[PDB]
Amino acid sequence: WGYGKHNGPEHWHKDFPIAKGERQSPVDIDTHTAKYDPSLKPLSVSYDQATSLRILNNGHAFNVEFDDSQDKAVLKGGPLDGTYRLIQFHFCWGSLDGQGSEHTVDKKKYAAELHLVHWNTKYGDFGKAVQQPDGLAVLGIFLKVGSAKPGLQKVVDVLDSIKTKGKSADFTNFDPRGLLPESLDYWTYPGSLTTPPLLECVTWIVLKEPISVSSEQVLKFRKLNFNGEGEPEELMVDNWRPAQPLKNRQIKASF
Ligand SMILES: [Zn+2]
Secondary structure, eight states, X not given: OOSSTTTSTTTGGGXXXXXXXXXXXXXXXXXXXXXXXXXXXXEEEEOTTOOEEEEEEOSSSEEEEEOOSSSSSEEEETTOOSOEEEEEEEEEXXXXXXXXXXXXXXXXXXXXXXXXXXXXXXXXXXXXXXXXXXXXEEEEEEEEESSOOGGGHHHHHHGGGGOSTTOEEEOOSOOGGGGOOSOOOEEEEEEOXXXXXXXXXXXXXXXXXXXXXXXXXXXXGGGOBSSOTTSOOOBOOOOOOOOOOXXXXXOEEOO
């Protein structure tokens, strides 16, 4: 699987039949249809004790990994029940500023999308969580092009070192708190992983308020390669999946 013409999103259902399931992601958020739900609790992000370890190019994106052997970087509150631990974060981006996000707001597409992945500690490890309907919590944050994001610069400078598939780099003392918007107002719905195996185990929480990155910041993303070192160069762009049918599900808002 990939994002090309022959192994792209439209073809995933062949090896991953859950591709046309009832709770696939991403989706389009109809802000006029979302239900204001007064019983949602504010989100609780505890990231001050976060420990980053490395960044790697997995051939379809780049992941920043965190030590999740203890409750160091956790998510709770909101629509969640129990504690979710930060295991890793990645992005989806486009070839142009006009596309890149997975989730769309009134059909509007953003330059990129940041996904903060967390797993339910009641399940003991990430592999068990992905077997549960309440196994993960993904924190989705939109990126728009304007002013630079001071806090994202550290990531951008290290991409040179993981240009190709399989590369990884030590990436310590990276504080995720630098990638958060001022507001924590959100939309939430039941969904899935947006990349194979596309397991229907996620509780999506999409921030209303986007973060702005500079054009040169995002330009650096477009320079990564899908391919392994020594292979024809395939630039790592448009690694996002098209919006799926909502099918009955309801999108709720905390505002
Ligand atoms: Zn993702």
